[PDB]
Amino acid sequence: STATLCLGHHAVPNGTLVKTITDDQIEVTNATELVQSSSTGKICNNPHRILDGIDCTLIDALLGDPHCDVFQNETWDLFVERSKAFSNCYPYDVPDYASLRS
Amino acid sequence: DTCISECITPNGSIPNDKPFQNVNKITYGACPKYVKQNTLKLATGMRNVPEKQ
Amino acid sequence: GLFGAIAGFIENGWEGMIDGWYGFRHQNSEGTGQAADLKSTQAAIDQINGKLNRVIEKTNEKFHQIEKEFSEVEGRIQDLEKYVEDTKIDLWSYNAELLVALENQHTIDLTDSEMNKLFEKTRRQLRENAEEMGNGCFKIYHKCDNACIESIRNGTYDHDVYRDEALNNRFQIKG
Amino acid sequence: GLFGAIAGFIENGWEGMIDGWYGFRHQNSEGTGQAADLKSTQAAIDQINGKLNRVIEKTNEKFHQIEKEFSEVEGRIQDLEKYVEDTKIDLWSYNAELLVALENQHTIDLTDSEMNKLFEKTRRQLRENAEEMGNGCFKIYHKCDNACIESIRNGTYDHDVYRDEALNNRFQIKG
Amino acid sequence: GLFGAIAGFIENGWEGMIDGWYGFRHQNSEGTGQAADLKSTQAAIDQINGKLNRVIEKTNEKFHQIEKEFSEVEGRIQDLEKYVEDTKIDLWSYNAELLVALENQHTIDLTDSEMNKLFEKTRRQLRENAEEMGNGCFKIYHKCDNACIESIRNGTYDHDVYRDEALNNRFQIKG
Ligand SMILES: *[C@@H]1O[C@H](CO)[C@@H](O[C@@H]2O[C@H](CO)[C@@H](O)[C@H](O)[C@H]2NC(C)=O)[C@H](O)[C@H]1NC(C)=O
Ligand SMILES: *[C@H]1O[C@H](CO)[C@@H](O)[C@H](O)[C@H]1NC(C)=O
Ligand SMILES: *[C@H]1O[C@H](CO)[C@@H](O)[C@H](O)[C@H]1NC(C)=O
Ligand SMILES: *[C@H]1O[C@H](CO)[C@@H](O)[C@H](O)[C@H]1NC(C)=O
């Protein structure tokens, strides 16, 4: 005699709350994270030329402190400096060290 | 380590797929923008209205 | 959302509809049935994917910048060096927060719109052969077997074919 | 706004309706009357309040920054110190201006939507018992005393109860 | 757009209508004809022009700032001087990109809305004298010469005058 068509939309057993203009938290069906908050902890040696300073700081590799002579003529895309790198040659100082390093 | 990653941060490399990152403000290469937030969900679907009602 | 269809005149949603985002459910003389609409489903998916592209994977590339951590107290320059970066991060954090807010308000109103569009597409196909219940359902005033229901679903429903039947029932006499 | 109800098909507004934002006005055999709709009124109020929260009272906390006023001409650094701050203030002023613009466009379109939603909620309740005048009014084609008018206002109006009466008048004969 | 009228239920557009943005086309007993609607056309034009003003011709005025190009390598300060400017340009480039995106989404949804508004204005004028085909056309169930068609176009169409005629045809008998 008569029939019944009903329009509708899907839903899911577990939505995710999202912020909007009016709602701080409202439930959508699905959503993605736009903020990256994790690292592997290691530095990939590619595609950038990562030259590790090890016990030396760029400045000492520059001046040629003996333990650093191993860097003579090195190049890099990113020179990495370690926290406990040390200088073991004539005591010195670099007025405006930050600029020479930069 | 031996792997591939354009974005390097002092905390180690991080994937540059998402637009922003909360790992470190110091970055090198193709990296996401550093922001104070830790999570930012972009809705990718309609509202979810279960048969709760 | 702005359209009052999803979380409005359409009570709740179907966790059962897993082959689409929008669709139909029906009951005729012989039974019940259900089926997802691909068109509206793709419109929604397509818009959200477009939106998703603009945001995702669009990183700048920066190399040597300024320093941002310091070993000793220095004064005027490091203050400035810190202020520049701090200022930068807050404006970028404002940028992110606002984008997700506007984007999400927009995705919700949009998908609301696509439900309602389907509804008006169907309402218009059904001409004088059906009346709206107001819960997202049309009460078809004539016999409509599953093939009939499908013709509607795929927009080939010819309302002239069922007019007289429909009209009659919609306007029956107490006799 | 986008919905064409407020400052559109609904001529003007009621300074007289002080117990709500949206509501009804009617005229039947015995008289006239008026009453505010709470639901739509709260939807509007609620959304605007949500929006109001995100903006209001969310201040950062900053302590020692850079200097911004100077006693003597200095050159390179003070130029930079001034440029950093000036640059910061303009980007923040852009931020404020745009937010109010987008927010306001949004509040207007939103409240437009809630009027229209009410209208479609009512239109759907009235089934074949009423026809739309187009100025926001439905012409109910059957006797509807204040209790009848209220049943509509609180969504319990049963249109089957008044169908035959309504239909008859909507489709009277020149006889 | 959000409204499903333009690039939705209204198939395509008229390159032929050059005196307006929105309008009508008709076919009656004596012929065919066409004419642009000024109102909707001005609403669209007006909103877009308002939007256009806010953006256009609103430049700041800046005079002595910092230097931005350098002859020699210097270090710490020039790094900072470059970082400040670079940072400024990216935040401004984000600003421009986003504005055009939001503005354009908005202009499209807006003009969609104005088409649909016209449609609902006309739908409401036609009362029970016409039925919707669903491609943007109303099938007027009564004789409507060009003067009749114009009365609709300029909103003076009185549907009581043609009711009985219309009703009759909309609900003819197989006899
Ligand atoms: C990334 O590394 C930094 C240090 O390089 C971590 O930040 C410090 O961590 C603790 C806890 O979050 C705080 O008390 C320090 O003050 C933080 N320092 C800074 C500058 O923020 C950071 O949490 C690391 N994050 C990840 C995900 O590895
Ligand atoms: C009619 O609708 C679509 C149009 O492409 C078609 O693919 C569909 O399968 C048709 N329905 C059936 C049952 O064939
Ligand atoms: C029917 O509508 C609401 C539902 O909560 C109720 O509170 C209201 O007072 C009712 N109307 C009357 C006159 O009781
Ligand atoms: C009726 O509509 C407008 C109202 O201003 C008027 O200017 C128009 O010319 C009228 N139509 C005709 C043919 O006069």
Kindly give, in sequence order, each residue whose CB lies less than 8 Å from that of residue E33, ignoring residues fewer than 6 positions away. E25, E26, E146, E149
What single letter denotes the amino acid at residue C35? A
Q: Pocket of ligand 2, candidates C151, C154, C156: which has the most ligand atoms within 8 Å of its Cβ, to mutate?
A: C154
Structure-token pair, residue E76: 């710490």
Residue C10: name the closest of C103, C125, C111 by CA. Answer: C111
3-state secondary structure A31-65: EEECEECCCCCCCCCECCCEEECCCCCHHHHHHCC
Window 96-125 of C: residues touching A by CB (8 A cutoff) are 96-97, 100-102, 104-105, 107-108, 111, 115, 118-119, 122
Q: Which of residues 9-38 of A touch C (CB under 8 A)?
A: 9-13, 18-22, 26, 28, 32, 34-35
Torsion of CA D116, D117, D122, D123, to 10 degrees: 60
3-state secondary structure chain B: CCCECCCEECCEECCCCCCEECCCCCCEECCCEECCCCCCEEECCCECCCCCC
Report in angstroms the alpha-carbon separations of D142 from A99, A101, D67, D129, D167.
89, 90, 76, 7, 9
**What is the whole-number distance in angstroms between the Cα of residue D154 and the centre of ligand 3?**
6
CB C159 within 8 A of CB C127: yes
Distance of CA E172 to the CA centre of its chain: 38
Q: Say how many Å lie between the CA of residue B17 and the centre of ligand 1.
A: 21
Residue D52: Cβ-neighbour burial (10 angstroms; 0-12, 13-18, 19+): middle
User: Under a CB-based contact definition with an 8 Å cutoff, are residues B20 and A36 in contact?
Assistant: yes
As a whole number of Å, the CA-based R_g of chain C is 27
Separation of alpha carbons D161 and D165, rounded Å: 9
Tokens found for residue D22: 């949206």
Q: Could you tell me the resolution of this structure in angstroms?
A: 2.8
List phi, psi (to 5°) of D14: -95, 105
How many whole angstroms separate alpha carbon E86 and alpha carbon D159? Answer: 67
Distance from chain centroid for Cα E136: 15
Start-to-end CA distance of chain D, whole Å, equals: 45
Structure tokens at A97: 């060290």
Angle between helices E76-125 and C76-125 (to 10 degrees): 20
Note whether D126 and D148 are within 8 A (CB).
Answer: no
Q: Which among C2, C76, C90 has CB closest to D110? A: C2
Q: Do C66 and E80 touch (CB under 8 A)?
A: yes
Question: What is the crossing angle of helices D76-125 and E76-125, to 10°?
Answer: 20
Distance (Å, whole) CA C152 – CA C124: 11
CB D94 within 8 A of CB D128: no
Q: By CA distance, what is C5's nearest residue in D?
A: D117
Question: DSSP assignment of D27-61, as one string?
Answer: E-SS-EEEEEEHHHHHHHHHHHHHHHHHHSS----
Evaluate whether D109 touches C2 at the Cβ level (below 8 Å): yes
Of E66, E102, E113, nearest to D83 by CB-CB distance is E66
Six-digit token string for E132: 């919707």
Contact state of C135 with A10 under an 8 Å Cβ cutoff? no
Residues with Cβ within 8 Å of D52's Cβ and at least 6 positions away in sequence, in order, are none
Query: Å from A95 to nearest chain B CA?
Result: 25
* Pure H helices in chain D: 38-55, 76-125, 146-153, 159-170
D66 — contact with chain E (CB < 8 Å)? no
What domains sit in chain E, N to C, each tagged with a CATH number? 1-175 (3.90.20.10)
Chain centroid to Cα C125, Å, comes to 21
> What is the three-class DSSP state of E60?
coil
CB D53 near ligand 3, within 6 Å: no
Q: Hey, what amino acid is at E133?
A: M
Name chain C contacts of E101, Cβ cutoff 8 Å: 54
What DSSP string describes C107-159?
Answer: HHHHHHHHHHHHHHHHHHHTGGGEEE-SSSEEEE-S---HHHHHHHHTT---H
Neighbours of D70 (CB within 10 A): 10
Residue B14 to residues A19, B20, B42, C33, C54: CA-CA distances in angstroms?
25, 11, 20, 49, 21
Characterize the bridge pairing of strands B20-21 and B33-34. Answer: parallel
Report d(CA E86, CA E65) in Å as an integer. Answer: 14
Q: What are phi and psi of D101, to 5 degrees?
A: -60, -55
Place of tokens 């009453």: D35
DSSP state of A71: G
Chain E residues with CB-CB distance to A100 below 8 A: 75
Q: Closest Cα partner for B34 from E132, E49, C91?
A: C91
User: Helix C76-125 to helix D76-125 angle, to the nearest 10 degrees?
Assistant: 20
Residue E105's nearest CA partner among B43, A34, C50, D100 is C50
Q: Which residues contact C50 (CB under 8 A, 6 or more apart)?
A: none
Where are the alpha helices (H) located in E74-158, listed in sequence order? 76-125, 146-153
C167: part of which helix (H) or strand (E)?
Answer: helix C159-170
List, in order, residues 6 or more apart from E165 with CB less than 8 Å away: E129, E141, E142, E143
Which ligand has the shortest distance to the CA of C39?
Answer: 2
Amino acid at A25: Q
Tokens 């202020």 belong to C83
d(CA E40, CA E22): 7
Asked if residue B10 has a cis previous peptide bond (ω within 30° of 0), the answer is no
Q: Is A4 on the interface with D (CB under 8 A)?
A: no
Eight-class DSSP state of D10:
B
Question: Is the CB of C12 less than 8 angstroms away from the CB of B7?
Answer: no
- Please give the Cα distance from E129 to E159 (Å, whole number): 7
Angstrom distance (rounded) from CA C109 to CA C53? 19
Evaluate whether C79 touches C70 at the Cβ level (below 8 Å): no
Q: Which residues contact D99 (CB under 8 A, 6 or more apart)?
A: C98, D55
How far is Cα of residue E118 from the mean position of the Cα atoms in its chain? 10
Question: d(Cα E153, Cα E156) in Å, to the nearest integer?
Answer: 8
Angle between helices D38-55 and D76-125 (to 10 degrees): 170
Distance of CA D112 from the midpoint of ligand 4 (Å): 29
Nearest to B27 by CA among D31, C88, A87: C88
Q: Residue C44 is inside which H or E element, if any?
A: helix C38-55
Q: What is the C-alpha to C-alpha distance for residues A71 and B30, in angstroms, rounded to an integer? A: 27
**E101–C106 C-beta distance less than 8 A:** no
The method recorded for this entry reads: X-ray
